């Protein structure tokens, strides 16, 4: 078994049976891929996407849309089982009556969304109103999309749909291309492994794609398209006056750019990127992404007292939203060496050891993932040190 | 009618007039929320995530697919997923064969989930490993579930905690979580007594509780808590019961399963109704309000007041304070109109920047809550806002670690 995926499965970044840890299974989205460490890593990534694209941008608003669309091409259809049963009860068929049923399914049944684009379009007229028709602006959503494989794969997509006058659309597309690529790179240990290329679709529309170089090859993690206006006009038949936005004095139907990232594949990219057979394997996930910031353990000494102290430190750090692994809670004894190796595989940023010394003089032993050196710190400072350290890494962007 | 109409007008809600009836709002057949509403809901979901997961070292995140293995034997009402190809292929490409085809759909097609429970159950053994089998612990998830309407598909965002505990302590945990969840809804409410609970029991004598919000048309359940026992967990691992045991001290037991399940969309609607006060103002809790501050300009040099505002804007966003940039509009609106609008959008504070500000750095700050105005130095606003928001959330967090009985 490949080492990175093996470690990820052992440390609960990935879930699944061993056969589901193949490249094809991991890329298909046909099983829930992530275990608790992975779900947390992915939530951190999604939060960082939200910060960059919605929180820090006044012209981007959140949107939410259904998972199913009116029914498109290969998308699975939603069919009520009660309708099928109704049919299977009646003794006389036909072929006319059955074919009819099947025919009617193919034309009236809703279908699973393949992208988040249609949800943004359908909410455009309302956001336009909210912004008093001023262009440009965006609508953003993170949510699951469904993809026929070759079973239906599920992928978490982070979408920005940007509405701008056609005359600035090319400029906007290039701005998003650079910004999005820099966003992926800012969390990477090997930022050159995130690359980009131009592409064009079936219709000749221009776009770009962003890629991560996985061991087996490059996989697209984000696509950016200059869609023009057809999809928007397709959404609002007749009523054109209600979709025109202001470009200064001009009233115009805006051009639509779609900027869509694969949060799941992006999670897997950072897991591969983090792997350092440095020392023993370590996952050096970026501080803002690492699911566990600190681990707390008790050394040789008085069980119940040494744990009362860790509990207090845990509670303090959690009130401050710092994730903590309560190793002190464990029963089985494990060597310091074994602990550090595990924490390193889990991408834990700092490990803290509370000992009889601590009970005497209040000093803890603090070990860093990145340098791997141990320092003595007074328990009273730990919180401020950690709170400050994370804020520093998050400020870098 | 006034509330829904105001919400629709201010983009808390979305939809046509036929989508704004109480029936359509409850069905989940359309995406109910406009941008201010999606932000409100995101804030509510973040608060839930903080209280249930971030602050609880024995609760872990789980993610599970939206689709589940096809069954059909039972007759369940969950929508099935059918490949259009498959249908076309039998269609344009006799009776015996068609009936068999339909039978197959019912038996083998995947189905859309109706709850997040099975998701948690299926990841229980992994989490067991993660905690080296120590009970109790929980698996949490927020995600969309689907449900039959009337033949339409309703979508509801569910916030679920599935808690694994020894049977001997399961009753106490049920009571602990009930109090905890009820207090969680109430801490954001203008009228907390409109959030209540009721105890209940199921077909099999299993105990549960339900939490309700008293909407204008009656009480609606916004959360359910059930002491499920172990049946469902046991059914998830047939033939592996010996190795799904957790530790209760020194004893190995198959844990009892507590399922706590909250409706995030209905909860969002609850807070919209709860915030509505007569001027019409929505007094949403500071932690929930989608826009914390609006910045506007009064009398003065356009291109300079705007720079003061933008600077202010940049500073607040950088600090993650949501801000409405009213100064970028054209402004042919009165102060009273501007304020009435902000009150309806639940904006917590509005700030006015004028010539004077350029002379002495003073801005006029207006509170949604009292409508009182007040001069303040533009350099002190970021700090005022951050402290006001931290204070509100601290007050709200007062009892997140309170030991219920
Ligand atoms: Na924004
Ligand atoms: Na937790």
Swiss-Prot record, chain B:
- Gene3D superfamilies, alphabetized: Anticodon-binding domain, Bira Bifunctional Protein, Domain 2
Note the CDD domains from the entry. GlyRS-like_core (cd00774), Pol_gamma_b_Cterm (cd02426)
Keyword terms of this UniProt record:
DNA replication, DNA-binding, Mitochondrion, Mitochondrion nucleoid, Transit peptide
InterPro entries listed in its UniProt record: aa-tRNA-synth_II/BPL/LPL, Anticodon-bd, Anticodon-bd_dom_sf, Gly-tRNA_synthase/POLG2, GlyRS-like_core, POLG2_C
Q: Report the Pfam families cross-referenced here.
A: HGTP_anticodon (PF03129)
GO MF annotations in UniProt: DNA polymerase binding; DNA polymerase processivity factor activity; DNA-directed DNA polymerase activity; double-stranded DNA binding; identical protein binding
- Where does the protein principally reside? mitochondrion
For this record, the Gene Ontology CC terms, alphabetical, are: gamma DNA polymerase complex; mitochondrial matrix; mitochondrial nucleoid; mitochondrion
Q: Which Gene Ontology BP terms does the record give?
A: DNA repair; DNA replication; in utero embryonic development; mitochondrial DNA metabolic process; mitochondrial DNA replication; mitochondrion organization
Cellular location of this protein?
Answer: Mitochondrion; Mitochondrion matrix, Mitochondrion nucleoid
Q: Where is the signal peptide?
A: none
Outline what the protein does. Answer: Accessory subunit of DNA polymerase gamma solely responsible for replication of mitochondrial DNA (mtDNA). Acts as an allosteric regulator of the holoenzyme activities. Enhances the polymerase activity and the processivity of POLG by increasing its interactions with the DNA template. Suppresses POLG exonucleolytic proofreading especially toward homopolymeric templates bearing mismatched termini. Binds to single-stranded DNA.
Q: What is the annotated quaternary arrangement, including any partners?
A: Heterotrimer composed of a catalytic subunit and a homodimer of accessory subunits (POLG:POLG2).
Q: What is this protein called?
A: DNA polymerase subunit gamma-2
Q: Source organism lineage?
A: Eukaryota, Metazoa, Chordata, Craniata, Vertebrata
